[PDB]
Amino acid sequence: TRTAISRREYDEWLSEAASLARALRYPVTPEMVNDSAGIVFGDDQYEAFAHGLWSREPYEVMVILESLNEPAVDGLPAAGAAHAEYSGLCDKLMIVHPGKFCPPHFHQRKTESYEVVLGEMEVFYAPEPVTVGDDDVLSFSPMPEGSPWPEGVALPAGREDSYAGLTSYVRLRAGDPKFVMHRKHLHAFRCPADSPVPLVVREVSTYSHEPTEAPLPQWRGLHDNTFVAEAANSGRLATAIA
Amino acid sequence: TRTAISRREYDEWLSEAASLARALRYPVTPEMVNDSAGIVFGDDQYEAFAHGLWSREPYEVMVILESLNEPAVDGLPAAGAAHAEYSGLCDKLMIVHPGKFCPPHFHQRKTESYEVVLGEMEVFYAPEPVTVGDDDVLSFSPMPEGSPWPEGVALPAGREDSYAGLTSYVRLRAGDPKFVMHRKHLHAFRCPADSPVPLVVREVSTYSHEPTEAPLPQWRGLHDNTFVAEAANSGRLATAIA
Amino acid sequence: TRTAISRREYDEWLSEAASLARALRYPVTPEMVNDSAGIVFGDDQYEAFAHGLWSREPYEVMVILESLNEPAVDGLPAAGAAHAEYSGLCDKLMIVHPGKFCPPHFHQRKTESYEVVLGEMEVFYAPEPVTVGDDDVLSFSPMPEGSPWPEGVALPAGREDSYAGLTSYVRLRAGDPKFVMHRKHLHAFRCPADSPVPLVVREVSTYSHEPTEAPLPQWRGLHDNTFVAEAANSGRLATAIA
Amino acid sequence: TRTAISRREYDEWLSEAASLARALRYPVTPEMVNDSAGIVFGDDQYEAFAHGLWSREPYEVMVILESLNEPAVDGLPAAGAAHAEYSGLCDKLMIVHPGKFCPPHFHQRKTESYEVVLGEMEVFYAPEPVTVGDDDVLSFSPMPEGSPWPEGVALPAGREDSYAGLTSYVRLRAGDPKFVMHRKHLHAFRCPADSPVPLVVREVSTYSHEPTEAPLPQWRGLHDNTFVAEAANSGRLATAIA
Ligand SMILES: O=C[C@@H](O)[C@@H](O)[C@@H](O)CO
Ligand SMILES: O=C[C@@H](O)[C@@H](O)[C@@H](O)CO
Ligand SMILES: O[C@@H]1[C@H](O)[C@@H](O)OC[C@@H]1O
Ligand SMILES: O[C@@H]1[C@H](O)[C@@H](O)OC[C@@H]1O
Ligand SMILES: O[C@@H]1[C@H](O)[C@@H](O)OC[C@@H]1O
Ligand SMILES: O[C@@H]1[C@H](O)[C@@H](O)OC[C@@H]1O
Ligand SMILES: O[C@@H]1[C@H](O)[C@@H](O)OC[C@@H]1O
Numbered sequence: 001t002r003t004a005i006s007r008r009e010y011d012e013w014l015s016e017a018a019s020l021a022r023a024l025r026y027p028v029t030p031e032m033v034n035d036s037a038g039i040v041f042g043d044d045q046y047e048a049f050a051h052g053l054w055s056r057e058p059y060e061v062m063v064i065l066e067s068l069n070e071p072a073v074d075g076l077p078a079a080g081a082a083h084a085e086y087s088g089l090c091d092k093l094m095i096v097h098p099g100k101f102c103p104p105h106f107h108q109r110k111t112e113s114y115e116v117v118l119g120e121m122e123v124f125y126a127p128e129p130v131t132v133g134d135d136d137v138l139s140f141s142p143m144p145e146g147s148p149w150p151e152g153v154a155l156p157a158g159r160e161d162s163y164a165g166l167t168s169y170v171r172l173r174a175g176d177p178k179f180v181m182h183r184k185h186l187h188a189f190r191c192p193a194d195s196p197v198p199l200v201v202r203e204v205s206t207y208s209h210e211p212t213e214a215p216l217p218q219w220r221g222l223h224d225n226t227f228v229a230e231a232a233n234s235g236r237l238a239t240a241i242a
Numbered sequence: 243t244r245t246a247i248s249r250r251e252y253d254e255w256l257s258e259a260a261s262l263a264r265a266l267r268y269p270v271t272p273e274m275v276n277d278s279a280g281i282v283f284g285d286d287q288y289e290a291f292a293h294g295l296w297s298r299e300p301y302e303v304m305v306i307l308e309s310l311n312e313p314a315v316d317g318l319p320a321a322g323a324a325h326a327e328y329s330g331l332c333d334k335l336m337i338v339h340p341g342k343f344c345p346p347h348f349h350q351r352k353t354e355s356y357e358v359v360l361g362e363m364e365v366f367y368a369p370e371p372v373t374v375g376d377d378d379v380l381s382f383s384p385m386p387e388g389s390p391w392p393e394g395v396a397l398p399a400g401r402e403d404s405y406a407g408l409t410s411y412v413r414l415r416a417g418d419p420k421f422v423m424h425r426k427h428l429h430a431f432r433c434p435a436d437s438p439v440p441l442v443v444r445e446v447s448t449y450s451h452e453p454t455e456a457p458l459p460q461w462r463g464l465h466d467n468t469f470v471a472e473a474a475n476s477g478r479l480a481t482a483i484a
Numbered sequence: 485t486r487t488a489i490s491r492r493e494y495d496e497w498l499s500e501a502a503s504l505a506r507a508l509r510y511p512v513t514p515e516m517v518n519d520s521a522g523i524v525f526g527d528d529q530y531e532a533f534a535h536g537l538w539s540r541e542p543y544e545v546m547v548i549l550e551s552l553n554e555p556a557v558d559g560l561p562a563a564g565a566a567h568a569e570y571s572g573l574c575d576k577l578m579i580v581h582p583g584k585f586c587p588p589h590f591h592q593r594k595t596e597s598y599e600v601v602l603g604e605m606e607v608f609y610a611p612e613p614v615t616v617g618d619d620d621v622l623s624f625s626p627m628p629e630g631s632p633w634p635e636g637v638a639l640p641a642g643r644e645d646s647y648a649g650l651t652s653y654v655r656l657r658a659g660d661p662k663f664v665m666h667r668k669h670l671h672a673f674r675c676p677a678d679s680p681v682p683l684v685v686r687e688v689s690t691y692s693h694e695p696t697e698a699p700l701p702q703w704r705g706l707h708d709n710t711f712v713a714e715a716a717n718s719g720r721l722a723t724a725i726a
Numbered sequence: 727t728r729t730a731i732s733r734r735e736y737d738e739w740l741s742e743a744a745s746l747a748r749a750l751r752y753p754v755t756p757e758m759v760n761d762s763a764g765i766v767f768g769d770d771q772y773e774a775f776a777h778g779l780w781s782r783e784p785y786e787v788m789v790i791l792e793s794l795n796e797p798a799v800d801g802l803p804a805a806g807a808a809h810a811e812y813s814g815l816c817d818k819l820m821i822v823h824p825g826k827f828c829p830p831h832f833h834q835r836k837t838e839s840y841e842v843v844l845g846e847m848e849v850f851y852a853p854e855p856v857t858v859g860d861d862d863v864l865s866f867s868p869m870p871e872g873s874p875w876p877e878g879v880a881l882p883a884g885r886e887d888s889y890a891g892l893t894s895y896v897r898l899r900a901g902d903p904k905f906v907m908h909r910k911h912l913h914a915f916r917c918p919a920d921s922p923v924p925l926v927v928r929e930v931s932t933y934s935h936e937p938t939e940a941p942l943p944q945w946r947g948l949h950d951n952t953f954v955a956e957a958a959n960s961g962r963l964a965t966a967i968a
């Protein structure tokens with residue numbers, strides 16, 4: 001069974017992704033195309049390359065090209081240092097092939113928004129937030145109810161139940177209003193298995209805390225991604241390339 | 243002297259801007275194309291329409307198509323409500339015609355980033371931040387020094403003095419990495435007068451406090467745009483459309 | 485009544501057209517943006533500027549940006565000189581605002597194809613060709629039957645009957661197969677009056693004979709455009725700019 | 727040595743090419759993505775897939791997405807049937823990966839033009855045309871002289887001699903005007919080996935006589951592509967897909 005992605009498969013994967021990105025005018029510089037841009041959520045997901053990104057089979061694998069991840073700490077009153085981690089600015093372009101997913105997870109600090117550029121994006125999420133740390137939190141524009149799931153959605157083998165809690169559904173297309181995914185909400189999304197093209201979506205969010213193999217001292221070693229499936233909560237880290 | 247823009251001049255201005263935006267794949271919704279999107283920074287700037295947006299003359303007027311201005315207050319610990327106004331997520335496409343400017347100003351709370359989509363962007367700014375209050379302010383990655391202004395830049399008549407403090411200069415082009423403009427920094431920008439196309443720039447910043455059309459009680463009536471020129475300061479809002 | 489287009493209206497018209505073109509990646513160089521690119525079919529059509537290109541009123545006015553018009557005579561056996569005028573290569577980008585048309589006409593020599601890039605294009609045409617010169621002509625892929633006209637089409641005032649002979653209709657969208665309009669077929673097209681954006685279509689055709697204010701001697705002074713409305717068959721020539 | 731391409735390698739190749747094409751707004755229909763679109767010029771060129779399309783190695787292989795190949799025979803006077811094969815309209819998007827080439831060859835009948843959409847195109851050609859027959863041939867605007875080849879160009883092993891006659895060189899970039907390649911001129915082109923993206927070029931030419939999948943009886947079985955290298959000449963058609 002696949003336990004890693006060959007160097008050829010990885011380079012072709014990231015090279016076509018970055019080319020598609022540039023074609024769509026996304027600002028891609030060389031340092032953005034690296035060994036951690038092509039993510040495989042869990043070792044059992046390397047099997048996605050047994051048949052390839054165009055097999056239309058359900059797997060949690062994607063490429064992320066990050067053009068910005070600004071802490072936005074400069075100029076902030078020291079008084080706000082404690083919650084500065086809930087702010088910041090991040091701009092990423094995400095490429096998901098037909099039938100593949102960004103697995104169920106949530107962020108304690110990061111609030112994000114989606115802009116579909118190419119293809120269509122099916123988002124699965126939980127309208128009710130979880131509570132992390134202090135129970136006292138602000139509220140303004142609670143997550144919408146969306147719709148129930150459509151029929152025929154193929155979920156990854158052995159990961160089906162990690163989607164049980166993401167009962168709301170919304171299908172996003174290019175040109176639709178920006179979709180906001182508030183922090184502390186379980187969410188996931190896939191590119192329709194029958195899509196003629198890879199899904200390309202721009203994510204604009206607050207700072208993305210993802211320890212790489214510090215704006216403020218309390219930001220060091222901060223992990224802001226909590227995955228439902230324990231198996232994927234691990235792989236998100238590094239990519240096994242052979 | 244022009245004291246307003248005609249309905250025809252306005253509708254054509256906004257219609258061509260929205261078309262250009264859609265062509266570049268920016269998500270424009272009908273609600274984004276409104277009578278507040280075409281901005282004229284001061285009553286003496288309505289004169290820009292005496293000769294038109296292709297006269298290549300120096301005036302402070304522009305179009306802003308805002309696709310997102312998310313408070314990002316939901317899920318934020320109440321303990322951080324006092325500095326929430328420094329966060330949030332704003333996504334807008336700015337369209338500036340040849341020779342025109344986004345007037346000198348700074349934001350106490352908003353930190354922005356620029357992504358040139360079409361044409362080129364000449365940015366003028368103060369490398370040193372203005373001191374709003376005095377209390378401890380955080381630091382991490384101060385504004386780069388930049389370069390001196392090139393020769394040839396024509397400033398708006400009567401407003402040239404307001405650009406005196408913006409000694410640093412940088413020319414951004416499509417494909418360049420993201421350029422960050424930290425809060426409390428005086429800045430302005432223009433589309434080169436010789437440009438064959440309007441400057442089209444995607445701005446991703448923190449929340450934009452601009453009563454144009456409340457997430458938190460404190461945010462009510464808050465204005466986070468302070469312009470160097472008084473003329474553009476006060477009479478900056480509502481656009482006079484005849 | 486309008487008998488010409490002001491210099492401001494023309495420059496704004498062509499400048500936005502060329503910017504939209506470049507945004508769509510069409511190869512536009514300065515010599516392409518000239519005094520003959522913005523066409524007004526007949527002096528009675530200058531009235532289109534009384535209310536402007538965004539009034540959605542029916543008029544026969546459009547901009548044509550020609551990037552190629554290659555005779556393709558080089559290398560051709562001298563034996564084919566006689567019909568060389570039916571060959572050649574022409575590449576043009578056409579921009580038609582909401583509700584405006586490219587008027588009923590036909591070409592004796594030019595065969596063309598359409599590729600909608602932005603917006604939608606409604607083509608009105610005659611499936612049966614006319615005979616010009618010798619009656620003996622080749623046949624292979626006769627023009628399709630298309631569909632009858634949809635309801636609600638607003639035709640230009642005083643030009644309604646020039647559309648009587650173009651009974652077939654087809655609506656083209658971005659991504660559809662190339663639509664071929666064989667030579668000697670009456671045709672016209674408009675941008676839906678309710679369109680949010682100007683129609684942008686790429687035309688790939690054989691050489692475009694349009695005497696400007698010679699590959700082969702018999703090509704000198706060749707006029708290959710025959711308009712139904714005599715009033716437009718004249719204006720096609722030059723553009724009255726004041 | 728590789729003697730064919732696997733179904734997976736082929737489907738990924740064509741799928742990513744079609745996606746990139748659609749991203750750039752080229753009109754791709756399902757029928758355009760077929761088993762004849764991925765071209766391998768000679769059995770010894772299948773070795774390009776030993777290391778892949780991103781190995782940046784010199785091989786003669788490419789993808790052609792043909793949206794149009796119109797005879798333009800309809801309405802053509804019978805008197806010009808003998809030279810109809812030199813006319814017609816062909817529109818195709820060519821996708822060439824870093825380091826790869828469109829092998830040396832000339833067309834007796836087809837005249838082409840290039841429009842670079844993404845990346846850069848290095849064209850190698852003979853400024854003087856080859857003399858097919860001898861009969862009078864027409865002239866109007868002979869091929870420009872061009873410049874000498876730059877240093878660094880790696881040619882395909884075993885085919886380097888076939889490029890000896892293509893002494894002229896020109897580097898085309900997106901936004902450049904159309905570049906015409908008159909018929910009877912030997913030519914070849916490649917995507918620079920250091921390119922971060924595949925070369926994407928729109929070709930507009932006269933009819934392409936290439937029995938891949940009759941407008942005139944004479945056109946039956948006609949092949950208008952003559953390659954310098956015999957290897958690529960004969961075994962150029964059908965792609966061996968395992
Ligand atoms: O760069 C300028 C941005 O902050 C703009 O959205 C505001 O200044 C509006 O004038
Ligand atoms: O430049 C090359 C073009 O003629 C191509 O469409 C053919 O040569 C196919 O090999
Ligand atoms: O994934 C492979 C290929 O890319 C697809 O087209 O068919 C199935 C095969 O396993
Ligand atoms: O941060 C990455 C992505 O930007 C987000 O949408 O989902 C989690 C993933 O690790
Ligand atoms: O005064 C302006 C600016 O502040 C200075 O740095 O360069 C000249 C310009 O006019
Ligand atoms: O054409 C003018 C304007 O551009 C449009 O929006 O409304 C009608 C007016 O006459
Ligand atoms: O040649 C122009 C255009 O390219 C064609 O489609 O219609 C006639 C007009 O004059």
Ligand SMILES: O[C@@H]1[C@H](O)[C@@H](O)OC[C@@H]1O
Pocket residue numbers: 875889890891892893894
């Ligand atoms: O032989 C090739 C070409 O014909 C010549 O002009 O430059 C060197 C190259 O290898």
Ligand SMILES: [Mn+2]
Pocket residue numbers: 105107112
């Ligand atoms: Mn997420």
Ligand SMILES: [Mn+2]
Pocket residue numbers: 347348349354
């Ligand atoms: Mn600002």
Ligand SMILES: [Mn+2]
Pocket residue numbers: 589591596
């Ligand atoms: Mn025509």
Ligand SMILES: [Mn+2]
Pocket residue numbers: 831832833838
């Ligand atoms: Mn060729």
